[PDB]
Structure formats: structure tokens, C-alpha cells
Scaffold this active site. Structure first.
Site, PDB file in Angstrom:
ATOM      1  N   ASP A 261      54.615  37.931  27.142  1.00  0.00           N
ATOM      2  CA  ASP A 261      53.642  37.088  26.465  1.00  0.00           C
ATOM      3  C   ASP A 261      52.316  37.821  26.329  1.00  0.00           C
ATOM      4  OD1 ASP A 261      55.370  34.971  26.053  1.00  0.00           O
ATOM      5  OD2 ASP A 261      54.818  33.956  27.923  1.00  0.00           O
ATOM      6  N   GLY A 262      51.971  38.594  27.355  1.00  0.00           N
ATOM      7  CA  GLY A 262      50.755  39.386  27.338  1.00  0.00           C
ATOM      8  C   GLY A 262      50.787  40.400  26.214  1.00  0.00           C
TER       9      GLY A 262
ATOM     10  N   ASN B  17      46.219  31.278  23.841  1.00  0.00           N
ATOM     11  CA  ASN B  17      46.467  30.572  25.091  1.00  0.00           C
ATOM     12  C   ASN B  17      45.297  29.672  25.484  1.00  0.00           C
ATOM     13  OD1 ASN B  17      49.089  31.217  25.796  1.00  0.00           O
ATOM     14  ND2 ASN B  17      48.508  33.094  26.888  1.00  0.00           N
ATOM     15  N   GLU B  18      44.201  30.284  25.918  1.00  0.00           N
ATOM     16  CA  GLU B  18      43.034  29.519  26.339  1.00  0.00           C
ATOM     17  C   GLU B  18      41.761  30.358  26.332  1.00  0.00           C
ATOM     18  OE1 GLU B  18      45.205  30.719  28.977  1.00  0.00           O
ATOM     19  OE2 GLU B  18      43.598  32.215  28.915  1.00  0.00           O
TER      20      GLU B  18
ATOM     21  N   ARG C 152      30.149  21.838  38.434  1.00  0.00           N
ATOM     22  CA  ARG C 152      29.838  22.952  39.326  1.00  0.00           C
ATOM     23  C   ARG C 152      31.099  23.367  40.078  1.00  0.00           C
ATOM     24  NH1 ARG C 152      27.977  23.817  44.974  1.00  0.00           N
ATOM     25  NH2 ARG C 152      26.536  25.603  44.989  1.00  0.00           N
TER      26      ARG C 152
ATOM     27  N   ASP D  90      34.222  26.885  40.030  1.00  0.00           N
ATOM     28  CA  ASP D  90      34.622  28.235  39.656  1.00  0.00           C
ATOM     29  C   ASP D  90      34.445  28.436  38.159  1.00  0.00           C
ATOM     30  OD1 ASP D  90      35.306  28.340  42.308  1.00  0.00           O
ATOM     31  OD2 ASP D  90      37.318  29.146  41.980  1.00  0.00           O
TER      32      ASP D  90
ATOM     33  N   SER E  38      48.969  26.148  35.736  1.00  0.00           N
ATOM     34  CA  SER E  38      48.654  26.535  37.107  1.00  0.00           C
ATOM     35  C   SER E  38      47.422  25.809  37.639  1.00  0.00           C
ATOM     36  CB  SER E  38      48.440  28.046  37.197  1.00  0.00           C
ATOM     37  OG  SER E  38      49.604  28.749  36.804  1.00  0.00           O
TER      38      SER E  38
ATOM     39  N   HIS F 153      42.525  36.280  28.272  1.00  0.00           N
ATOM     40  CA  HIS F 153      42.272  37.329  29.259  1.00  0.00           C
ATOM     41  C   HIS F 153      41.619  38.548  28.615  1.00  0.00           C
ATOM     42  CE1 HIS F 153      43.856  39.242  33.265  1.00  0.00           C
ATOM     43  NE2 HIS F 153      42.540  39.268  33.157  1.00  0.00           N
TER      44      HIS F 153
HETATM   45  N1  LIG Z   1      48.708  38.996  30.797  1.00  0.00           N
HETATM   46  N2  LIG Z   1      47.849  38.378  30.911  1.00  0.00           N
HETATM   47  N3  LIG Z   1      46.997  37.766  31.027  1.00  0.00           N
HETATM   48  C1  LIG Z   1      46.731  36.842  29.927  1.00  0.00           C
HETATM   49  C2  LIG Z   1      47.203  35.438  30.296  1.00  0.00           C
HETATM   50  O1  LIG Z   1      47.307  35.258  31.703  1.00  0.00           O
HETATM   51  C3  LIG Z   1      47.247  33.858  31.863  1.00  0.00           C
HETATM   52  N4  LIG Z   1      46.929  33.568  33.257  1.00  0.00           N
HETATM   53  C4  LIG Z   1      45.852  33.937  33.917  1.00  0.00           C
HETATM   54  S1  LIG Z   1      44.591  34.844  33.291  1.00  0.00           S
HETATM   55  C5  LIG Z   1      43.277  34.327  34.428  1.00  0.00           C
HETATM   56  C6  LIG Z   1      43.090  35.356  35.516  1.00  0.00           C
HETATM   57  O2  LIG Z   1      42.156  36.135  35.486  1.00  0.00           O
HETATM   58  N5  LIG Z   1      43.981  35.334  36.493  1.00  0.00           N
HETATM   59  C7  LIG Z   1      43.881  36.282  37.598  1.00  0.00           C
HETATM   60  C8  LIG Z   1      45.254  36.461  38.215  1.00  0.00           C
HETATM   61  C9  LIG Z   1      46.196  36.437  37.210  1.00  0.00           C
HETATM   62  C10 LIG Z   1      45.953  37.097  36.018  1.00  0.00           C
HETATM   63  C11 LIG Z   1      46.897  37.081  35.004  1.00  0.00           C
HETATM   64  C12 LIG Z   1      48.087  36.396  35.186  1.00  0.00           C
HETATM   65  C13 LIG Z   1      48.320  35.742  36.383  1.00  0.00           C
HETATM   66 BR1  LIG Z   1      49.832  34.856  36.632  1.00  0.00          BR
HETATM   67  C14 LIG Z   1      47.383  35.757  37.398  1.00  0.00           C
HETATM   68  N6  LIG Z   1      45.913  33.492  35.154  1.00  0.00           N
HETATM   69  C15 LIG Z   1      47.047  32.822  35.263  1.00  0.00           C
HETATM   70  C16 LIG Z   1      47.589  32.180  36.283  1.00  0.00           C
HETATM   71  N7  LIG Z   1      46.903  32.185  37.410  1.00  0.00           N
HETATM   72  N8  LIG Z   1      48.762  31.566  36.190  1.00  0.00           N
HETATM   73  C17 LIG Z   1      49.431  31.607  34.988  1.00  0.00           C
HETATM   74  N9  LIG Z   1      48.848  32.281  33.938  1.00  0.00           N
HETATM   75  C18 LIG Z   1      47.669  32.874  34.097  1.00  0.00           C
HETATM   76  C19 LIG Z   1      46.101  33.473  30.987  1.00  0.00           C
HETATM   77  O3  LIG Z   1      46.378  32.233  30.385  1.00  0.00           O
HETATM   78  C20 LIG Z   1      46.123  34.486  29.896  1.00  0.00           C
HETATM   79  O4  LIG Z   1      46.523  33.844  28.709  1.00  0.00           O
HETATM   80  N1  LIG Z   2      27.136  32.762  50.252  1.00  0.00           N
HETATM   81  N2  LIG Z   2      27.955  32.087  49.790  1.00  0.00           N
HETATM   82  N3  LIG Z   2      28.793  31.379  49.299  1.00  0.00           N
HETATM   83  C1  LIG Z   2      30.108  31.310  49.961  1.00  0.00           C
HETATM   84  C2  LIG Z   2      30.601  29.869  50.170  1.00  0.00           C
HETATM   85  O1  LIG Z   2      30.889  29.247  48.941  1.00  0.00           O
HETATM   86  C3  LIG Z   2      31.927  28.371  49.157  1.00  0.00           C
HETATM   87  N4  LIG Z   2      32.522  28.082  47.851  1.00  0.00           N
HETATM   88  C4  LIG Z   2      32.883  28.879  46.870  1.00  0.00           C
HETATM   89  S1  LIG Z   2      32.790  30.421  46.800  1.00  0.00           S
HETATM   90  C5  LIG Z   2      34.140  30.817  45.628  1.00  0.00           C
HETATM   91  C6  LIG Z   2      33.608  31.685  44.531  1.00  0.00           C
HETATM   92  O2  LIG Z   2      33.816  32.883  44.491  1.00  0.00           O
HETATM   93  N5  LIG Z   2      32.913  31.049  43.627  1.00  0.00           N
HETATM   94  C7  LIG Z   2      32.247  31.729  42.506  1.00  0.00           C
HETATM   95  C8  LIG Z   2      30.847  32.290  42.957  1.00  0.00           C
HETATM   96  C9  LIG Z   2      30.267  31.544  44.010  1.00  0.00           C
HETATM   97  C10 LIG Z   2      29.584  32.108  45.087  1.00  0.00           C
HETATM   98  C11 LIG Z   2      29.045  31.291  46.089  1.00  0.00           C
HETATM   99  C12 LIG Z   2      29.180  29.913  46.041  1.00  0.00           C
HETATM  100  C13 LIG Z   2      29.874  29.383  44.968  1.00  0.00           C
HETATM  101 BR1  LIG Z   2      30.161  27.703  44.694  1.00  0.00          BR
HETATM  102  C14 LIG Z   2      30.376  30.173  43.987  1.00  0.00           C
HETATM  103  N6  LIG Z   2      33.370  28.216  45.870  1.00  0.00           N
HETATM  104  C15 LIG Z   2      33.337  26.973  46.214  1.00  0.00           C
HETATM  105  C16 LIG Z   2      33.733  25.940  45.528  1.00  0.00           C
HETATM  106  N7  LIG Z   2      34.232  26.216  44.339  1.00  0.00           N
HETATM  107  N8  LIG Z   2      33.630  24.715  46.011  1.00  0.00           N
HETATM  108  C17 LIG Z   2      33.082  24.569  47.269  1.00  0.00           C
HETATM  109  N9  LIG Z   2      32.674  25.692  47.960  1.00  0.00           N
HETATM  110  C18 LIG Z   2      32.815  26.881  47.415  1.00  0.00           C
HETATM  111  C19 LIG Z   2      32.830  29.196  49.968  1.00  0.00           C
HETATM  112  O3  LIG Z   2      33.567  28.368  50.834  1.00  0.00           O
HETATM  113  C20 LIG Z   2      31.903  29.984  50.823  1.00  0.00           C
HETATM  114  O4  LIG Z   2      31.805  29.351  52.058  1.00  0.00           O
END
Ligand SMILES: [N-]=[N+]=NC[C@H]1O[C@@H](n2c(SCC(=O)NCCc3cccc(Br)c3)nc3c(N)ncnc32)[C@H](O)[C@@H]1O
Ligand SMILES: [N-]=[N+]=NC[C@H]1O[C@@H](n2c(SCC(=O)NCCc3cccc(Br)c3)nc3c(N)ncnc32)[C@H](O)[C@@H]1O
Ligand SMILES: [N-]=[N+]=NC[C@H]1O[C@@H](n2c(SCC(=O)NCCc3cccc(Br)c3)nc3c(N)ncnc32)[C@H](O)[C@@H]1O
Ligand SMILES: [N-]=[N+]=NC[C@H]1O[C@@H](n2c(SCC(=O)NCCc3cccc(Br)c3)nc3c(N)ncnc32)[C@H](O)[C@@H]1O
EC number: 2.7.1.23
Lengths: 259, 263, 260, 250
Positions: A45-46, A114-115, A140, A142, A158, A215
Site C-alpha cells: 500500500d505504501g 489515506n489520511e 490537547r 498527540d 489503529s 506519511h
Molecule cells: N508506509 N507507510 N506509511 C504510510 C501509511 O502508514 C499508515 N500508518 C501509520 S503512519 C503514522 C506513523 O508515523 N506511524 C509510525 C509507526 C508506523 C509507521 C507506519 C506504519 C505503521 Br503500521 C506504523 N501509522 C500506522 C499505524 N500505526 N497503524 C496502521 N497504519 C499506520 C498511515 O496511514 C500512512 O497512510
Molecule cells: N517534560 N515533559 N513531559 C513529559 C510528560 O508528558 C506526559 N504526556 C505526554 S508526553 C507524549 C508526547 O511525546 N507528546 C508529544 C510532546 C509532548 C511533550 C510533553 C508533554 C506533552 Br502532552 C506532549 N503526552 C501525554 C498525553 N498525550 N497525555 C497526558 N500526558 C502526556 C508524559 O506522561 C510525560 O510524563
């Protein structure tokens, strides 16, 4: 007619590619990788995604078809064993899938098969979700993921998104690890938007975001607004037998009792 | 035109009803609860559901309108204070109509006959005591074997109800589709399910076929009746649609925002 | 010592039962009144019935389960091992493993009823929406509206709890887990959403808001309690005892059931 | 004793306000051998104070002051800084030990592992026995107190910190026929080891609380409940569940 074939890069795909060109060497077909009417993707697919973006300027003038050399794909639905049957049958009806238009504001536009996802580039990801010029929620976490119908079986699935049949012209917004507390209350549920609906993502604090389209992760700086809507453009598939979308969903996630 | 009004039952709704009937009684409006063209529900969404099912044989000749005497509803979009402006615009005929899709539920026995049901929100199927075990057949092709509490097929407008609590996605009612969600699926090696909610377009048929027990608890907009000796339960988007009378603009996402985010 | 055997009811279980009893015919006497070894043949539901059948003699009973069908989490031994089972227990060469239990207390408007759970205890409405206040240790936590709530034992997390999206806990952990059942999580009835894991001596109190009639189930034993004033959950001091022979890891058992 | 600061002026001023108090009760400021560590700022500030002294956790009682919102580690408001110095029982929370293959790490919140530029594919080995083959974004092993952080956003359960355990949650698992995962969060007790083994790619992005580091040539990532515990200095009674309530319920 005019055609071209892309390859994943490995030996299996390159071999099957050359063999098909040789297969095309037994019918009235011309190889053109510049102005093709049929683009054939070999790999996964990629690979199909790369083939889509390679010719996203002639989608109205190109019918795509995919072969999976590895596991069953949702775009590459043809087996290597059917490579002989392909060149014969193509030498057919067309199926169209919706696309996602992504607009960035500093204006850059992107097409997604895809997205399209948006994350932060070095801090918490905080944006305002504006639906049709009206504020809906403050997110707020990821990030956020706006998915195409065909893309719901990918990253969307996923992330807990629903699976939609590609005949439905829509988009699906899903949350990525949203912090759902008293300050940042979000809907939680995935959201499916019809045509002419525009989802606008507006920055709260940080204005630099990591935006990926199928991606294709590029770091956009000084972002003022990120707009989402169903593209008027569509990708066209070349259909021969009947391989239902739900069957591909079944074979991928449930079971495949004959493989 | 010919109209009628249903009431939640409390004093606030009954009082507002009589006042509206008097209001329509100053125009060319006739009260008819048998063959109405305008059905007005006063109370809540549950009240609106009862009015819908009360006239499910005349949906093509009826434009529904809902007034919420309590909290804001997804079908009851009018405040009691706008009942005066409502009667004025309905008497003048100054309104356009908006249609939402509906869900057809078909049950099949060992032929005793065959029953069909229309849902505005959703249709659910559960077991009559034991575990709920059925085969999910999509367009004459087996998809999965389910074991759990039950399954929920929702309309687009019904996605904001039971569907959302069950983890379903929210779809805009302008989309002609239906959405299947799991109800406590065991999802193991024997009964492997998709987990994800499934959105089906028109002309797609989801067939639920029994494995062991043939007695199922089927509910349509919370009207649960025990069907015995069931052979097949079919789901598909009905060709019928419910028609709403639109005056102002109350966006679906606004209605979602006001309900679940903050108001 | 004294033993007895329960059956799922079908021919496979009944036949396997008599064949095992015939095997004991060792210094083993059949006593279903004061047994020291309880053998369940069938499924987890069969094991649950055997557990509740002797919940008054849990300190003097080591349980063991046989699954005549697919692998269960309490009935984890295969039928082909029925010969080896009878042999190893007759010598008495085995160690005992204990799992935590869930104490359920109901309070009316009258006395108060208490129940022991091996899997879980759920509470739903007996007609209409389910609306209760979730009070944790005499302190209000949230106001729930939906289908119901589920308080699970550690071993029961692999049952109803998992289907409801709950976490899986290793039974060596003495705790309980609360999960939501289709919460309408809006502005009025805001719930936590996440599953909640409570330790020992922690009391989760469910108190009615409007309706006072609830459907309370303990390991799938649904009875309609009227005039309910309070439903209390806490980890019971009592424990269920298992007869251990070989090493069948909990996570391995989880793997064989859901992963394979 | 010693005091840490968020870095902004609000914390620095508040720090100076408390330090002046300590010169009248018999405690000397020692950043080498402290017995009481005071954090001023937020939970993130508290984390830095935790990681600053991971070698003396057995001889230190921590305390946190939130200059902003109620934190799960910082439960004291600045207005109660006066009451602090006068009083200044012990409460212990479990920790997560992370081992990379040798590098070792201690976590107060959680430890996550993702890929460094591609799909994340690993084998999850629980107690020397294969459990599942994961494909997705990554995995998250959380401490009990850390369950209210990143863990909660990933759909994990909230467990009371008196429980000595760790909780594994998935990050966007593809969960298909080839890579079948459990889906559910997994809570592991003491002495349980979750081993993550690479399949193809051996470069992973590993983060501990907030220390994201790119490890190359990873052979094994081991998770288990550490024998070490973080000690808090408690004065009044602030229940964990009320703290959960105040944050997410409102
Ligand atoms: N090849 N490739 N990558 C392109 C597609 O991969 C799909 N995909 C992305 S991309 C988002 C990403 O940065 N993921 C980091 C780990 C990861 C990368 C690529 C594939 C996978 Br599996 C995991 N994550 C996906 C995911 N967790 N589950 C099922 N599809 C995913 C996206 O929908 C893109 O369309
Ligand atoms: N310093 N600092 N931050 C780290 C803390 O942030 C908490 N956290 C993380 S970090 C995951 C991450 O890489 N996010 C993208 C950048 C980021 C950096 C720092 C804080 C945040 Br939010 C985001 N996401 C969290 C989430 N979505 N919900 C609730 N707690 C989260 C983690 O549990 C760590 O304890
Ligand atoms: N009430 N009412 N009207 C019927 C609608 O109620 C919606 N609904 C149902 S009905 C299913 C059922 O038997 N629920 C038992 C407890 C319950 C009954 C009625 C309302 C509520 Br809230 C709870 N549960 C729902 C739920 N948990 N969340 C959000 N919508 C729900 C269904 O979608 C029906 O369309
Ligand atoms: N039978 N039996 N055993 C009873 C156990 O069944 C487990 N269980 C229950 S019981 C709750 C119930 O009444 N569900 C209605 C349909 C149903 C009944 C019984 C078993 C099943 Br499966 C389904 N539902 C469960 C579920 N959806 N997923 C996985 N375990 C479940 C509970 O933990 C009970 O302890």
C-alpha cells in the site's frame, strides 16, 4: 495504450515488473511513465501511495491498479499469481474513491489517499477545532487525524476510528491520545464529515506543526490555519473481478483461511 | 394545514400545547391527529421518537418539528419561547424541509411470517438470557462470528445516542448510511471480531444469522420485544426518510457541541 | 480425602465425571457435603456454579477445573489429562494458589445482603436509564448515567471486564477494577471514562439518584433488588484456593485464549 | 534540605521565601545530601527533581508545590508554603525500572518505546514466554502514579498508587491477522518482566518520563517494577481519587 509500472525496490517486485512489461510485449500496449493512462503499482500500500502522489496531477487521466508482493493490501489487492491474467484482461469498468484535500495557511494544498495528520514539533499539541467557521472544541494531546474512506482501514483503524465503505464520500476525524480533562474537553468519538464540510485547525500557543499527508511528514512553521475538506478530485481504479471492500477488511483483520 | 401536537405529559408541555393549538387557531390550520401534514412534539427526544413511530406510515406526507421543554435535544431543537414565531412561520408555510435517513430492520422466522421495523435512532439485538452468538454476513458473505452481549445498528442521526456510548463514530445526518457497533464482544480466537465500528452505505445488507440459540431480544428505538425462532435479521438503509421542517439554521455539529462539549 | 465432582450437564462432562470417579476407586471418599477437593467439568460457568455451591467452605476446599470444550480461565486443564489429574491428587503432591475475591454489599430501606464474586459484580437499572452517584471512600467521585457499572476481580478481568474495555490484571494482585457500561458521558453526567483499579480496604459506594430499583448480578446471578439505598464494593478478605500441579502462567492462558 | 525551581520568576521568588524560613529551625541547604527535596512549579518540574536524585531515593522525602494547576505530584498551593516549613508520615510510590541492551532507567510516570523513522515492530515476551507480535506506533509501560498521565490518554486504566504494579498500553496497534495484539491494557505485578524484542529494525526512540533518546542496536528492552520507591512528605490528606476527580471530572 499508454501505461507505466512502479516497483517497491526489492527483487520480487522488479522481477514481476519486467515480466509484465514483457507480458505487455505480447499485446498492443505502449510504455509511458510520463503520460500514462494506466499506472500499475507493485509492492504494498505504501508503494501504491507513492504511485498515487507521483501522478496526483493526472488523476483524472489515470486508472490505477495494485499488486501486493507481500501481505494483502487494501489498494494492492491483486496477487502475483494473477499477473498473467492482468495483462490479458487490461489489454474493464472503473471504480472511484474520494480524496482528502489538505490546506495549510502561513497557501499550500495537499491530496491524501489515506489520511492527513497534524502533530506538534517540540511541545504539547494544542489546537482549536473549528467546524464550518464555528468553534467546536479545544484539543490537547498527540495530534489529530483526518482520514479518507479508503484510509479508514489504515492509521485510522489503529487509532480507534470506524471503518467506512469507500463509496461514501466523507472524512473521518480521530483523536490521538487526547488529554480529556476539565480544561481540554474533547468529543472523544471519531467524527464523520460529509462533502462541503470544512474542518479548520487553528493554533493556540505553538504555531509550528508537524503535518503528514500519507506519511509525508514535513514541518510547517508559522501556521495560521489548517483546513480539511473532501476533495473534488477522485482516484480511479481498474476493476475486473469482484473483490469487495469488506472482504479485504475481513481477510486483513479477521482471518484468511486459504492463505 | 392539518397538524397535531404530542406532549411529554407534564404541565409545561401540556400548557404549551394548548397555547400553540390556540395560536394555530388564528390561521388556516386544522387539528388532525389522523392525517396530519405537520407533527409537533413537545418534550424531549424520547417524546419525539414516540411521535415518529405514531406516524411511521405517513412519513412522506409529514414534516416533523420538536420542542424541548427540558434540556436541548437532537430532534427537539426549538425552545418553548419560540413557539409563537413557530406558529407564525408554519401558518404562512415559510419553511423548507430537510430529510434524515432511516434504518430498516427485517426479521425472518421459520416459514411465522416476516416482520419489518423502522428506526430513527438505532436497532439492537441481544440474547434472551444466555450468551449472544450470531454470524455476521455482509452482502451474502460471512464476515465474522460474534459472541457477546449484542450488536447495535445506528442511523446517522442516531449516532449521537446509544451508538456514541458504545464507542461509535458521529456521522452528519446528511450522509446516507448506517453504523454497526459491538456490544461487549468477547473477541477471542474462536469469536474474532473487527472491534471497529462499521459504516455501511445504501444497498448494503448486514445479515445476522443465529448459531445456537434462535431467540433474540430485538429493540427498535427502545422498543424491546422477544422474537423467538429467528432465522435471519437483516439491516439496510431504508428508502424511507423522516422529513424535518427547517426555519432557522441549527447545525448538527453545533447540536453535538452544545450537548457533549459545553453549553 | 473427601472429594466431589460437578458436571456441565452434557454427555461429555457426565461421562468424563463417572470415569474420573471410577479412577478414585485410592483412599478417596466421595462427599459432596464436606469436600476437600472440588472438581469442575465443563466451562468457567460450570466452575462458577461450583464456586458458589461451596462458598461457605472455601477455606477447606482446593478447586480444580476441566474444560470439555474450549480452554477456560478457571477450567484450564484438558480432558485428556483426566487420568493424570486423579493420580497426582491422590498422593496429595500439590501446592495451593489463592486468588482475590470481590465482596458485594447491598443496603436497603431490612438488613443488608452480602455476596462473593469470583469474576465480577455488575449493576444496571431494572427499567430505564441507569443513574447513580459513584462514591469512593465516603467521597463523591462522579455521577454516572448509562447502562451500568462493573466491578471485577483480578481473575475476572479476562471475562466480562475485558469485553467492556477493561484492563487485564494478574491475579496475584489483590485489587478490584471498575469499568463503565455505555456511559452517556455528556455535560450533566461527566464520567472518568477510564477503568479504575482499587486496592484493598478501598470502598466504592454506588448510591441511587432517582430510581431505586436495580438489577444486581454476581458472577451472572441476576436478581432484582428493590428499594436499594446503597451498593458497596471492596476486595473481600476471603480467597479462592486452586490446586496447582504444573506451571500454567496466567499470561500464557491469556495468550492461548485471545492471541492464537 | 534543598529546593528546585521551575525556572520562571514565580518559582524563584517563592523559593527564596521558603529558604529564609529554614534558617530558623535547624536545617541547612545541601544539594549533595538532602533529606527533603522541594519542587516548585508543575509535575514536569517535579520530574526533573526526581531524576536529579535517582541515586538517593532511599534517603529523600519529596514534596511538590504547584505555581499553576493542581498536579498529581505537586499538591501544595503556594499559599501553604508557610505551613510547610513548620511541619518540615512518609508515603511510598512504586517505580518502573527500564533496562536496554547495558543501560538502566528509573521512571516516575512511564516509559515509552517507538521506532526512529518507520513502523514499530517488536515481540512482546512476558517472563521468557512469547505473548504477541506488535506492529504500530509503540508501547507504553506506566507506573501506578503515571497512569493519570500519558497512560490515560492511551486508554489505560487508572490504578491507585498503593498498588505495586506496572501497566502496559498500546500505541496505535494495527492488530490484524499477522500482528494480533491483546488490545487491552496489561497490569503486571512485582517480579514480572516484559521483554520487547526487535524483529527487523533495531533502532528505537525510547523515552523515560521526558528523556527521549535514540537507541541504535537494541537487542532487548526489559520492563519490571523497581525495588526502589519514591517517598513523599505528607502533611494534610489529599486522596488520590479526589485528585483524579478534580482533574478530569470537574
Ligand atoms: N508506509 N507507510 N506509511 C504510510 C501509511 O502508514 C499508515 N500508518 C501509520 S503512519 C503514522 C506513523 O508515523 N506511524 C509510525 C509507526 C508506523 C509507521 C507506519 C506504519 C505503521 Br503500521 C506504523 N501509522 C500506522 C499505524 N500505526 N497503524 C496502521 N497504519 C499506520 C498511515 O496511514 C500512512 O497512510
Ligand atoms: N517534560 N515533559 N513531559 C513529559 C510528560 O508528558 C506526559 N504526556 C505526554 S508526553 C507524549 C508526547 O511525546 N507528546 C508529544 C510532546 C509532548 C511533550 C510533553 C508533554 C506533552 Br502532552 C506532549 N503526552 C501525554 C498525553 N498525550 N497525555 C497526558 N500526558 C502526556 C508524559 O506522561 C510525560 O510524563
Ligand atoms: N430513552 N430513550 N429513548 C431510547 C433511546 O435511548 C438510547 N440509549 C439507550 S437505550 C438501550 C438501553 O436499553 N439502555 C438501558 C439504559 C438506558 C436506557 C435508556 C436511556 C439511557 Br441514556 C440508558 N441506552 C443509551 C445509552 N446507554 N447511552 C446513550 N443512549 C442510549 C437508544 O439509542 C434509544 O434510541
Ligand atoms: N455463562 N457464563 N458465565 C458468566 C460469565 O460471563 C461473563 N460474561 C458476560 S456475563 C454478562 C451478560 O449477561 N452478558 C449477556 C450475554 C452473555 C452472557 C453470558 C456470557 C456471554 Br459471553 C455473554 N458477558 C460477557 C461478555 N460480553 N464478554 C465476555 N464475558 C462475559 C461474565 O464475567 C460472567 O461472569
Amino acid at each position: 495504450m499508454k501505461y507505466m509500472i512502479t516497483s517497491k525496490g526489492d527483487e520480487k517486485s522488479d522481477l514481476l515488473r519486467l515480466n509484465m512489461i514483457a507480458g505487455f510485449g505480447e499485446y498492443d500496449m505502449e510504455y509511458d511513465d510520463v503520460e500514462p493512462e494506466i499506472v500499475i503499482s507493485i509492492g504494498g500500500d505504501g508503494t501504491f501511495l507513492s504511485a498515487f502522489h507521483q501522478y496526483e496531477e493526472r488523476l483524472d487521466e489515470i486508472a490505477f491498479i495494485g499488486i501486493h508482493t507481500g501481505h494483502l493490501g487494501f489498494y494492492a489487492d491483486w496477487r502475483p499469481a494473477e499477473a498473467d491474467k492482468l495483462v490479458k484482461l487490461l489489454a474493464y469498468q472503473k471504480v472511484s474513491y474520494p480524496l482528502l484535500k489538505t490546506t495549510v495557511k502561513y497557501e499550500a494544498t495537499y491530496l491524501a489517499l489515506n489520511e492527513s495528520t497534524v502533530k506538534s514539533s517540540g511541545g504539547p499539541f494544542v489546537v482549536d477545532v473549528v467546524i464550518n467557521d464555528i468553534h467546536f472544541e479545544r484539543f490537547r494531546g498527540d495530534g489529530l487525524c483526518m482520514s479518507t474512506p479508503s484510509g479508514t482501514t489504515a492509521y485510522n483503524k489503529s487509532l480507534g476510528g470506524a471503518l467506512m465503505h469507500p463509496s461514501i464520500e466523507a472524512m473521518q476525524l480521530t483523536e490521538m491520545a487526547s488529554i480529556n480533562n476539565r480544561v481540554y474537553r474533547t468529543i472523544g468519538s471519531p467524527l464523520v464529515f460529509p462533502k462541503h464540510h470544512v474542518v479548520s485547525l487553528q493554533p493556540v500557543n505553538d504555531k509550528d506543526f508537524q503535518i503528514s499527508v500519507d506519511h509525508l511528514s514535513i514541518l510547517h512553521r508559522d501556521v495560521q490555519e489548517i483546513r480539511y475538506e473532501v476533495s473534488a478530485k477522485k482516484i480511479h481504479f481498474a476493476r475486473f473481478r469482484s473483490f469487495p471492500f469488506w472482504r479485504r477488511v475481513h481477510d486483513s483483520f479477521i482471518e484468511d483461511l486459504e492463505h
